[PDB]
Design a protein around this nucleic acid. Structure first.
Lengths: 80, 25, 86, 108, 197, 216, 129, 121
RNA sequence: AAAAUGGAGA
RNA sequence: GCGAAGGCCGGGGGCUAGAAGGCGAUCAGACACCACCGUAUUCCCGGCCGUAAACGGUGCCGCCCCGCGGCCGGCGCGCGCGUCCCGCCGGCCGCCCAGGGAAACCGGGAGGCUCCGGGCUCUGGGGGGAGUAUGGCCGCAAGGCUGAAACUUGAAGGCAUU
């Protein structure tokens, strides 16, 4: 079976540790979210540590959990 | 338990010496 | 170049040249009583007939024990050319 | 000359445990070295179950089922034959033998 | 290559399953595990592997010298078929331990090549071959011990219909190299006679 | 005599098809017949030494099963050697079972070199380390200005191998000979077990002399 | 903690080759481990190598010819005069045919053979069998 | 009861299978005289012969009741080995088994074939 | 339930 | 700086077990084992002790590994969304492949090492004498901690086979 360490295979890399990969890279992303009422775009980390409130609505659009940040309003996928 | 009945026997021997060393002086 | 122990002249002082196991590059041992010489034969177009010439690989029993001689045989066959795109 | 890897105990990530005394020996044993067979037995003997069931004054009555734990000491277990010393091959067999899924203290 | 009529035979003849447990050296042959959990194999891999086995079988100087040892009930019916068309000297029944080392033992056979019916029911037979330097070729399940096994045939192996297709496929593939049994045509034999009631 | 060849390679040895012991060693073969090894070199060939006939008495219900066991070491000077031993009640049946065992295991010495390689080899190519139970031995290559530097038993074994000079160090129960003479032998097995820059090459898939293929 | 990168690399390369895996990784690239690796490649024991590079320690991926018998380090560096180079060949090299001890000299870093011939002796970084 | 040695049972085993002819299945009397043709076996004493002549009545009875372990009936060696040689109603073992889930179809999709237009039936 | 010795030295 | 139990020093407390001490009953003795009482103790507070088969009989921080499964902690992975799978796992582990070992066995090491050289503290050198003697230190004491010799004499010991 042909598997080569020098040229790293991207499919396995995702399952691998953020540090164990041939290059220790970020494993999280910035996601803009769509407030249903207004079209202001708020960028949020894939894992949020501090709450970001949608501009014009005082209530935080993201209540942080240990990893993924859920959103009270509908979610804009990643960057789209 | 021979080790226990030797060690504590040794301690009884050690104590005997203390009285003998001080009272005699 | 008289591969094996050779004299100052460069001719083989010791004739015995234990065949280096092909797969691991490590040699087959004098006492390698677990040694293996797998051989497979080539094919001829539409007929896919056997031409009586067969590529002969070698494998020590340590690779056998490693159970990795199966993946290794196919890759070694790619080196000998028998393996297709797979 | 270590006899068993477990050392007669299931202690892992630990240092000390509570002591439960043998019902027979009365010997204190740490929870780890105690047999702990759990036994389910009907309160009446099976022989007189029929006559007591025959005396079913209340409707649909069932026998009193008792749930208890038996914890003999190591020395109590061997002499009362709860378990038997086995050979090196038998040492790792993790199961009680003689099937017996029958529900009573006596295996019958 | 692969032939669809025969390919659909393997699929309909229990050669689409394996053990739920897996080993790293059988990962490539395995397609993956499905919701059912029995690992489902990849069909092209099976056919390609059977051609690779055929080339070693034509290579041996005496076609008779290959020995196939069957230690499992299911293997017997298909193993009987191997001897009818291929010339391999069979080694049937329980191995009778140490035959390869004990030349004095009655059924001792020196097979320049070996063939094992099941990876975990021939444990003595691969070690015995290791003592006598015999290149080891065998059948392997999704999960198998590859110890002392050089190359093997991905298969369900746990039902004789699959075992039947394997001895049928191998017999046909060596014969195709000899250019005798079919040559781009029908095999006289039919899929039955590869299972015992 | 006129032995029916016991081994399949025995038919090759009987035919004369086997060229020499070296050929079966190159193809890594098990030699199961004393005659099969004698065919390569018979008639006086190797000198024979026998020592250490320990009498193991195994305690049992009544009297111990007094029995004997002795070690036999092959000594052909042509870079081939073996260690064998036999257990039997009678003195004869013991040494003569051992003689068979040392014959059944024949291993080739590398016959290596240090500074001068013009003439024929004076030492083994690399330090040979042999582990037999407690005993671990070493055979560091020596220049020809050095002699066979060794312990009295271990030197006779290497004299039998025919390496003229050597540097020897040992660890373990040197007084127990069976481990020591086994160790120096298991070290001799290391002689060809080491990849050497000279040994490296890519080719030799000829297979025409597969002993198993070769048949009458 | 990790003081000797070369010991963690040497046993990284030796252990991998023992299993027969040609491609191996090394946790930190060092300009000195570059010296040992390229002197291994130069003598032909090791094959083409590469360092995937982050901005941090860097990881070394090396393909092997599979022929390595033994590699190792003398920790820490002990300095020997060019007069004593041969005593160290006796203890740490099997034979004088395949002898190579990594020496460090101010005028270039070479294996033992070239150095004594150049009449300069420095410190033995690591053993190369 | 009576249990006899390996040689006594093995001689009887040789007599019942390697020279079956027609040793009697349920009758002792033919067996009493059918074991003394001299060539078939030579042993002294009538009772010693009778020891083989005892087991033979059970061994032949066993063979009549069903096939023995490693049955080698000299008179009837080709018995049901023809059934292993036999094929059934038309030898149509194959065709229309189906039982393919979406992933089983995906396995055939992984090779180049697309079996039954990806619609097994 | 009790249940104790076994001189030295081949 | 802590450190189980037992011990000690003053109080408080005292249900059960129970060092001592008493009985009975055992056995040529029963000092004991076993029954029956029973004081100190055990429980709490404020101090001293500072030791245990305190043991995983295996100091610590690193690195590389051979696969197969559990248990716990998160965290992602797609999946008809089920504590479903699959990894990242940090720890708990079982069996074990080479490798190692006098062996027993270890192998998330006791391996990579007579081809004997990551770093760093500790400890040992035949079995006694001896943890003794003698000083110092510590404790209220019990005891701790540190630590020889004179002389002896040929094995002491380790794991395994019948």
């Amino acid at each position: 079976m042909n598997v080569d360490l020098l040229y790293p295979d991207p499919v396995e890399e995702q399952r691998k540790h953020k540090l164990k990969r041939l290059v220790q890279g970020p494993n999280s992303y910035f996601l803009e979210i769509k407030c249903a009422g207004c079209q202001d775009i708020v960028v949020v980390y894939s894992h949020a540590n501090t709450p970001v409130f949608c501009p014009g609505c005082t209530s935080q659009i993201s209540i942080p959990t240990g990893g993924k940040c859920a959103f009270t309003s509908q979610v804009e996928r990643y960057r789209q | 338990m021979r080790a226990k009945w030797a060690k504590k026997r040794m301690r009884k021997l050690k104590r005997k010496r203390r009285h003998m060393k001080a009272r005699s002086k | 170049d008289d591969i094996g122990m050779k004299n100052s002249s460069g001719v083989v002082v010791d004739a015995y040249i234990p065949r280096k196991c092909s797969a691991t590059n490590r040699l087959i041992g004098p006492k390698d009583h677990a040694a293996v010489q797998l051989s497979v034969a080539r094919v001829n177009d539409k007929g896919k007939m056997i031409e009586n010439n067969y590529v002969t690989f070698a494998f020590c029993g340590a690779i056998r024990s490693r159970g990795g001689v199966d993946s290794a045989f196919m890759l070694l066959a790619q080196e000998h050319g028998l393996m297709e795109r797979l | 000359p270590v006899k068993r890897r477990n050392n007669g105990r299931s202690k892992y990530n630990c240092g000390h445990t509570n002591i439960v005394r043998c019902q027979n020996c009365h010997r204190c044993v740490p929870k780890d070295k105690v047999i702990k067979r759990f036994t389910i037995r009907n309160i009446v003997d099976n022989t007189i179950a029929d006559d007591v069931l025959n005396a079913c004054v209340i409707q649909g009555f069932a026998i009193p089922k008792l749930y208890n734990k038996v914890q003999y000491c190591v020395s109590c277990s061997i002499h009362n034959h709860i378990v038997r010393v086995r050979s090196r091959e038998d040492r790792k067999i993790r199961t009680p033998p003689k099937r017996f899924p029958r529900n009573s203290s006596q295996k019958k | 290559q692969l032939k669809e009529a025969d390919v659909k035979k393997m699929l309909v003849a229990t050669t689409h399953l394996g053990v739920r447990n897996i080993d790293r050296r059988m990962q490539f042959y395995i397609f993956d595990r499905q919701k059912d959990g029995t690992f489902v194999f990849n069909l092209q891999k099976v056919w390609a592997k059977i051609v690779f086995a055929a080339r070693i079988l034509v290579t041996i100087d005496d076609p008779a010298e290959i020995a196939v040892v069957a230690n499992r009930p299911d293997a017997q019916r298909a193993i009987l078929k191997f001897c009818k068309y291929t010339h391999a000297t069979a080694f049937p029944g329980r191995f009778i331990p140490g035959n390869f080392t004990n030349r004095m033992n009655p059924n001792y056979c020196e097979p320049r090549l070996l063939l094992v019916n099941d990876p975990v029911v021939d444990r003595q037979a691969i070690l015995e071959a290791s003592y006598v330097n015999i290149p080891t070729i065998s059948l392997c399940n999704s999960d198998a011990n590859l110890k002392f096994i050089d190359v093997a045939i991905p298969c369900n192996n746990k039902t004789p219909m699959s075992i039947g297709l394997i001895y049928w496929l191998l017999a046909r593939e060596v014969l195709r190299l000899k250019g005798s049994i079919s040559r781009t045509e029908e095999w006289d034999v039919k899929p039955d006679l590869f299972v015992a009631l | 005599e006129e032995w029916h060849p016991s081994t399949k390679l025995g038919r090759l040895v009987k035919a004369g098809k086997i060229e020499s012991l070296y050929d079966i060693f190159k193809y890594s073969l098990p030699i199961k017949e004393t005659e099969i090894i004698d065919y390569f070199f018979p008639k006086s060939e190797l000198a024979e030494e026998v020592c250490n006939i320990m009498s193991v008495q195994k305690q049992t219900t009544a009297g111990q099963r007094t029995r004997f066991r002795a070690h036999v070491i092959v000594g052909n000077r042509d870079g081939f050697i073996g260690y064998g031993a036999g257990v039997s009640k009678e003195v004869a049946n013991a040494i003569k079972k051992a003689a068979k065992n040392a014959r059944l295991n024949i291993v080739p010495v590398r016959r290596g070199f240090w500074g001068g390689k013009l003439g024929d080899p004076h030492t083994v190519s690399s330090k040979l380390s042999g582990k037999c139970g407690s005993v671990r031995v070493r055979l560091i290559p020596a220049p020809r200005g050095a002699g066979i530097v060794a312990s009295p038993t271990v030197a006779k074994v290497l004299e039998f191998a025919g390496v003229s000079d050597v540097f020897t160090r040992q660890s373990g129960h040197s007084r127990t000979l069976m481990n020591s003479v086994g160790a120096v032998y298991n070290a001799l097995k290391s002689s060809y077990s080491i990849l050497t820059p000279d040994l490296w090459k890519k080719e030799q898939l000829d297979h025409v002399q597969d002993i198993r293929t070769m048949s009458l | 903690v990790r003081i000797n990168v070369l010991r963690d690399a040497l046993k990284s390369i030796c252990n991998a080759q023992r299993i027969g895996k040609k491609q191996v990784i090394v946790r930190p690239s060092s300009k000195v481990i570059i010296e040992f690796l390229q002197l291994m490649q130069k003598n032909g024991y090791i094959s083409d190598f590469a360092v995937v590079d982050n901005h941090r320690s860097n990881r070394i991926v090396v393909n092997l010819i599979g022929r390595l018998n033994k590699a190792g380090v003398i920790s820490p560096r002990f300095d020997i005069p060019a007069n004593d180079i041969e005593k160290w060949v006796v203890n740490l090299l099997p034979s004088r045919l395949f002898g190579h001890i990594i020496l460090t000299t101010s005028q270039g870093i070479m294996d033992h053979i070239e150095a004594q011939h150049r009449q300069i002796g420095g410190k033995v970084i690591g053993y190369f069998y | 009861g009576k249990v006899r040695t390996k040689t006594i049972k093995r001689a009887a085993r040789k007599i019942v299978e390697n020279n079956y002819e027609s040793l009697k299945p349920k009758d002792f009397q033919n067996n009493k005289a059918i074991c003394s043709k001299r060539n078939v076996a030579i042993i002294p004493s009538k009772r010693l012969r009778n020891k083989v002549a005892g087991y033979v009545t059970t061994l032949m009875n066993r063979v009549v009741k069903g096939p023995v372990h490693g049955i080698s009936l000299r008179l009837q060696e080709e018995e049901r080995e023809r059934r292993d040689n036999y094929a059934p109603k038309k030898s149509e073992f194959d065709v229309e088994n189906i039982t393919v889930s979406g992933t089983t179809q995906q396995m055939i999709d992984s090779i180049g074939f697309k079996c039954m237009s990806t619609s097994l039936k």
